[PDB]
Structure 1
Amino acid sequence: KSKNPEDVVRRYMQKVKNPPDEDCTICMERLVTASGYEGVLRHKGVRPELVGRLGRCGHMYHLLCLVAMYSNGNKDGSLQCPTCKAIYGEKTGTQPPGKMEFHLIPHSLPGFPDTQTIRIVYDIPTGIQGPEHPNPGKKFTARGFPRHCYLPNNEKGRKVLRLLITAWERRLIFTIGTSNTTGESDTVVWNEIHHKTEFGSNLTGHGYPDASYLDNVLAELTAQGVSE
């Protein structure tokens, strides 16, 4: 679906024909008067008097106010109610094309004795940045691919695997930006979901044993709108 502010916002807003004499809590003007937003998106846009009820919670805003607010955020397809903090829609990212593969290997991770290991392999080729990327039309590099990641094949590890597949499908695993280890810009980097790339030790901090890892990555996934 389109992630453009006006389209996303209109999707979750339901027109209020006769709004009350109460504040819009985005612009702090009354709902029976025009939106207080005065920026560039007003030009030939949403009529400033239009008011809607947002999603399931029903909180009411000038439609223009909520498109302005959404446009000042990440514009990731999800829309948060500023009154009650309910989130509507699905967060997606800018991960470029590639391949995600996984299978089982007959080796136990440190801290998960007598198990097999889920080996995940991500492969992302170089390409041209698209309109969703920081420098549209500029080439982007992709370093260190294929990247190998590991989870134990136990109940919680399989759960993480299901959720990583969803995050991959929502283009959330990788993004295009600046590497933290090299400083290179216009390059494929990890996004907000940590992976373990070191199998038999944790000298890098990205390895095992790590008894908190599975719970930690489940929280990161939930922070990206990916949960069961």
Structure 2
Amino acid sequence: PEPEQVIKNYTEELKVPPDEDCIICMEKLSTASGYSDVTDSKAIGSLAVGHLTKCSHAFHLLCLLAMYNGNKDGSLQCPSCKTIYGEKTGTQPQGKMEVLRFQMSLPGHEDCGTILIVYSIPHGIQGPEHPNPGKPFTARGFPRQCYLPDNAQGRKVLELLKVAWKRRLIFTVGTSSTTGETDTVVWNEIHHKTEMDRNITGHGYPDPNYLQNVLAELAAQGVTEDCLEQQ
């Protein structure tokens, strides 16, 4: 889990670095890391070069370490091909997700029924992964209802949302964009629809771009169609 440990976990030493540049610092792999002056490590020197263990893209290991300036969730993303090593997870506190389906249609989706997701997160105590470990956090507005059309795309989004939920990515502990309350349970860059009819609050359905948008948001957090498949 330690920052030097995860880089070794996802890399293999390149005995002879071929004649090429490291896309993180632009210095050739056969020469020193361009970030050696800034980044210090215990077991990684300026000349250490290695490749990621699925895509074989090569970098200075110190460059990759300086990159892993991020969440420190044990995950690492190739800057070249964006292949994700490990699994991005988040700080969603404990709670409950329930899924229902009814026949009534959402506006703009009169050809199908509706998926209803209900989330509930109780108040609690922040853990070491949270902004103020050991301090309380609050949780407003629960249970929260969210809506998806019960068509092929909405059913796919639902399956991905369940994965994001299990990865603690749906909610985080942060500052409410609406009340300014700090240390509270808020959304985490995966936008949900919380009303059926957008004309009441200005938020809801129809929204032709919504499903495409949320798939992209899920993918940016490493939740993809490939995550649904099992050998």
Q: For this structure pair, what is the TM-score category when the shorter chain's length is used for normalisation? A: 0.7 to 0.9
Question: Is structure 2 residue 90 aligned with structure 1 residue 106?
Answer: no
Greater shift, 165-174 or 14-23, is seen at 14-23
1:129 aligned residue: 126
1:90 aligned residue: 87
Q: 5+ unaligned residues in a row in structure 2: which ranges?
A: 226-231
Q: Secondary structure at the match of 1:132?
A: coil
Question: Is structure 2 residue 174 aligned with structure 1 residue 180?
Answer: no
Q: 5+ unaligned residues in a row in structure 1: which ranges?
A: none
Once the two structures are superposed, the pairs formed by residues 111-190 of structure 1 within 5 Å of their partners are 111-190=108-187
Alpha-carbon distance in 2 for matches of 1:30, 1:117: 55
Name the aligned partner's letter for residue 199 of structure 1: M
Alpha-carbon distance in 1 for matches of 2:153, 2:19: 50
Once the two structures are superposed, the pairs formed by residues 1-228 of structure 1 within 5 Å of their partners are 2=1, 4-20=2-18, 22-35=20-33, 36-39=35-38, 42-70=40-68, 72-228=69-225
Instruction: Give 1:32 deviation, angstroms.
Output: 4.2
Alpha-carbon distance in 2 for matches of 1:22, 1:196: 47
Alpha-carbon distance in 2 for matches of 1:198, 1:17: 57
Greater shift, 75-84 or 118-127, is seen at 75-84
Alpha-carbon distance in 2 for matches of 1:163, 1:84: 22
Indicate conservation of the 8 Å contact 1:202/1:209, yes or no: no
Alpha-carbon distance in 1 for matches of 2:20, 2:198: 59
- Give a deviation string over 1:163-182, Cα, whole Å, max 9, x none: 10011111110111111001
Instruction: Give 1:208 deviation, angstroms.
Output: 1.3
Q: 1:119 and 1:21, CA in 2 relative to 1: closer, same or farther beyond 3 A?
A: closer
Alpha-carbon distance in 2 for matches of 1:118, 1:152: 6
Provide the TM-score with structure 1 as the length reference: 0.87
Q: 1:184 and 1:49, CA in 2 relative to 1: closer, same or farther beyond 3 A?
A: same
Greater shift, 29-38 or 154-163, is seen at 29-38
Name the aligned partner's letter for residue 91 of structure 2: T
- Give a deviation string over 1:78-118, Cα, whole Å, max 9, x none: 32223444433322211111110011123221112253221
Provide the TM-score with structure 2 as the length reference: 0.86
- Give a deviation string over 1:185-213, Cα, whole Å, max 9, x none: 11110011111111234433431122222
Indicate conservation of the 8 Å contact 2:197/2:203, yes or no: no
Indicate conservation of the 8 Å contact 2:127/2:134, yes or no: yes
2:228 aligned residue: none
- Give a deviation string over 1:126-171, Cα, whole Å, max 9, x none: 1111111112121111101110111121211111110100111111
CA RMSD of aligned residues (A): 2.2
Indicate conservation of the 8 Å contact 1:13/1:53, yes or no: yes
Q: Secondary structure at the match of 1:203?
A: helix
Alpha-carbon distance in 2 for matches of 1:213, 1:33: 47
Alpha-carbon distance in 1 for matches of 2:32, 2:82: 24
Name the aligned partner's letter for residue 87 of structure 2: E
